Amino acid sequence: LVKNKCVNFNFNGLTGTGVLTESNKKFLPFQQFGRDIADTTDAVRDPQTLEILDITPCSFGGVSVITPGTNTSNQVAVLYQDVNCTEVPV
Amino acid sequence: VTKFNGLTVLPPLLTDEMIAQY
Amino acid sequence: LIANQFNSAIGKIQDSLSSTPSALGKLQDVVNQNAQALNTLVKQLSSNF
Ligand SMILES: *[C@@H]1O[C@H](CO)[C@@H](O[C@@H]2O[C@H](CO)[C@@H](O)[C@H](O)[C@H]2NC(C)=O)[C@H](O)[C@H]1NC(C)=O
Ligand SMILES: *[C@@H]1O[C@H](CO)[C@@H](O)[C@H](O)[C@H]1NC(C)=O
Ligand SMILES: *[C@@H]1O[C@H](CO)[C@@H](O)[C@H](O)[C@H]1NC(C)=O
Numbered sequence: 338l339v340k341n342k343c344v345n346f347n348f349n350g351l352t353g354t355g356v357l358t359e360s361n362k363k364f365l366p367f368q369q370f371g372r373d374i375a376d377t378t379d380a381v382r383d384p385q386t387l388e389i390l391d392i393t394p395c396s397f398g399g400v401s402v403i404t405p406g407t408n409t410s411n412q413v414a415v416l417y418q419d420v421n422c423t424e425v426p427v
Numbered sequence: 428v429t430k431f432n433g434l435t436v437l438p439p440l441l442t443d444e445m446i447a448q449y
Numbered sequence: 450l451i452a453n454q455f456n457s458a459i460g461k462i463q464d465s466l467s468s469t470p471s472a473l474g475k476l477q478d479v480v481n482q483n484a485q486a487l488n489t490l491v492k493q494l495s496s497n498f
Pocket of ligand 2: 406
């Protein structure tokens, strides 16, 4: 298992995709994997060692080019919307 | 007044603090 | 007297807004409508069509 790194995962046939992190929520002993309001998985109990892992989607967002007029200049800026710079270079 | 399947929300340009200041 | 009426009326706004849960029903309706729209959009992914 890999934490804090965006990795394809498959738990008992979940076949999801996203980064898995350590979670605080406590499942009941029989409760296999979590869910959200919109019926999208947002947690999973690790089957080997019984711990709850909060899964979150791989970071995505529009990339916009803040540029002045091409007649004024050719130097541009880039915005990576709703993402932290640590994973920007990827 | 009171996760992502490809859906993104964008922040208002005038944040809540600047809206309140306006 | 006008000043007292105005201030007490403002206190009435505060009390009515706090006590009545339907004071902000318009903006809360807008937010709930957007939430229902997005939730239905997500649920449409679960649909076979
Ligand atoms: C086989 O599965 C069992 C149960 O899931 C694992 O048992 C663990 O064993 C380690 C030491 O090897 C202990 O520290 C853990 O407490 C045990 N339990 C859990 C839930 O992890 C066992 O390691 C597995 N074997 C292999 C080779 O993966
Ligand atoms: C860019 O600026 C130059 C210099 O003022 C002007 O000649 C040109 O028309 C401008 N281009 C546009 C697209 O407005
Ligand atoms: C980037 O920002 C998030 C959200 O504020 C923060 O929790 C996180 O620690 C940052 N990422 C890293 C890898 O430090």
